[PDB]
Design a protein around this ligand. Structure first.
Ligand SMILES: Nc1ncnc2c1ncn2[C@@H]1O[C@H](CSCC[C@H](N)C(=O)O)[C@@H](O)[C@H]1O
Ligand SMILES: NC[C@H](O)c1ccc(O)cc1
Length: 258
């Protein structure tokens, strides 16, 4: 955990959202795959409501590109101040903000509604009402009197739980904790690394729990979810770059049981 005090937003973005992993031209890449899972899930029209919360957003927003057109009140979160400040720079279009345009363009491409990427980013920025601190290790991850509308109609969490858990049990509890934020019958979109044990973020070296698809499924079930969809992307050699040892990426569409 204290290892996250050395976490460098720019280094994390560089490692994971800049070429090669950040080049979206090849459909077989991890970027396009993640956006497709998100887009396809929301296109079903079955994941809807008013409020949504992004768990452990870090300094990234790609994970809300397709989502933002389905929820008018969006809450982004992260444990680190530096990350909340990094997000702020993009949301407020401040100087030095990260360039997500490639991802916006591709979310527009995939969605196929003829929408220009600027309108997309406009909508995301418009619907993100607040960026809050969060600790998934606490029974109440957002705290006591959080400005976030609870319970949420839906939750999105990408590369967080597994990335902040040393073992499987921590992972399960973390899932339990965030699940309390979700209204019954609500929906969870979980994206995470498969069989990864570490990843770098500048001077920071994060040690994480290598999980499998079955282990992830079993966790969702234990937390009281119905798994609507669980998919795996196997990481191509070309995208294995020594910023980590991830073998694949999973996407889970879980619905909290009423
Ligand atoms: N105890 C905790 N609770 C919630 N988030 C935590 C946490 N400890 C670290 N984090 C955050 O977990 C994030 C993992 S990086 C994930 C970034 C983004 N969601 C993605 O799709 O790439 C980091 O920003 C880190 O600050
Ligand atoms: N914990 C984040 C993990 O290292 C990761 C993040 C993003 C990727 O595309 C691949 C792997």
């Amino acid at each position: 955990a204290s290892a996250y005090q050395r976490f460098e937003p720019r280094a994390y973005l560089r490692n994971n959202y800049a070429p090669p992993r950040g080049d979206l031209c090849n459909p077989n890449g991890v970027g396009p795959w993640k956006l497709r899972c998100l887009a396809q899930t929301f296109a079903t029209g079955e994941v809807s409501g008013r409020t949504l919360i992004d768990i452990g957003s870090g300094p990234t927003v790609y994970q809300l590109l397709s989502a933002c057109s389905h929820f008018e009140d969006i809450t982004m979160t992260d444990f680190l101040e530096v990350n909340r400040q990094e997000l702020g720079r993009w949301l407020q279009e401040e100087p030095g903000a990260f360039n997500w345009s490639m991802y916006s363009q591709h979310a527009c491409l995939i969605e196929g509604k003829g929408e220009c990427w600027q309108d997309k980013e406009r909508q995301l920025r418009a619907r993100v009402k607040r960026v809050l601190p969060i600790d998934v290790h606490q029974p109440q991850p957002l705290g006591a009197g959080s400005p976030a509308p609870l319970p949420a109609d839906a939750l999105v969490s990408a590369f967080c739980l597994q990335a902040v858990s040393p073992d499987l049990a921590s992972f399960q509890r973390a899932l339990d904790h965030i699940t309390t934020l979700l209204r019954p019958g609500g929906h969870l979109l979980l994206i995470g690394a498969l069989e990864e044990s570490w990843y770098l973020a500048g001077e920071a070296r994060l040690t994480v729990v290598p999980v499998s698809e079955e282990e992830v499924r079993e966790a969702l079930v234990r937390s009281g979810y119905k798994v609507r969809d669980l998919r795996t992307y196997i990481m191509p050699a070309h995208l294995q770059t020594g910023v980590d040892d991830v073998k694949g990426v999973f996407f889970a569409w879980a619905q909290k049981v009423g």
